[PDB]
Amino acid sequence: ATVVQFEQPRRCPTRPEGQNYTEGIAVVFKENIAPYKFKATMYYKDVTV
Amino acid sequence: LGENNELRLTRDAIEPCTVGHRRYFTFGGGYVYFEEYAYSHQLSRADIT
Numbered sequence A: 001a002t003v004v005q006f007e008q009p010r011r012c013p014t015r016p017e018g019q020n021y022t023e024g025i026a027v028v029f030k031e032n033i034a035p036y037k038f039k040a041t042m043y044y045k046d047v048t049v
Numbered sequence B: 001l002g003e004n005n006e007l008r009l010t011r012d013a014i015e016p017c018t019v020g021h022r023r024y025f026t027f028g029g030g031y032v033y034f035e036e037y038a039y040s041h042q043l044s045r046a047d048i049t
């Protein structure tokens, strides 16, 4: 009357193929907060009485 | 028919006929069912716990 069976093998997950990476050289720039700086010369005369 | 879908060539598998005979045998991707040494019917895997 009562009859059972063994379970058969299963499909195991495939190992994912994986990511591909591009080799490159990179230079990262940011916002400039430094003021523009340039040298100048002042000419004036102090006066007093 | 041997075990696990094997095809045996020598029919030396006999037995004294008995009342109450009732057997399942692995056949194809399923089973075959004989009652009293008479072909009852094939039966796929899903219908056995």
Ligand SMILES: *[C@@H]1O[C@H](CO)[C@@H](O[C@@H]2O[C@H](CO)[C@@H](O)[C@H](O)[C@H]2NC(C)=O)[C@H](O)[C@H]1NC(C)=O
Pocket (backbone or CB within 6 Å): A017, A018, A019, A020
């Ligand atoms: C990175 O390159 C490999 C090269 O083999 C890709 O391999 C692919 O794998 C997928 C499975 O998702 C197949 O559909 C493609 O036919 C394969 N391509 C080749 C050329 O083999 C891999 O998929 C690539 N990266 C990603 C994220 O898929």
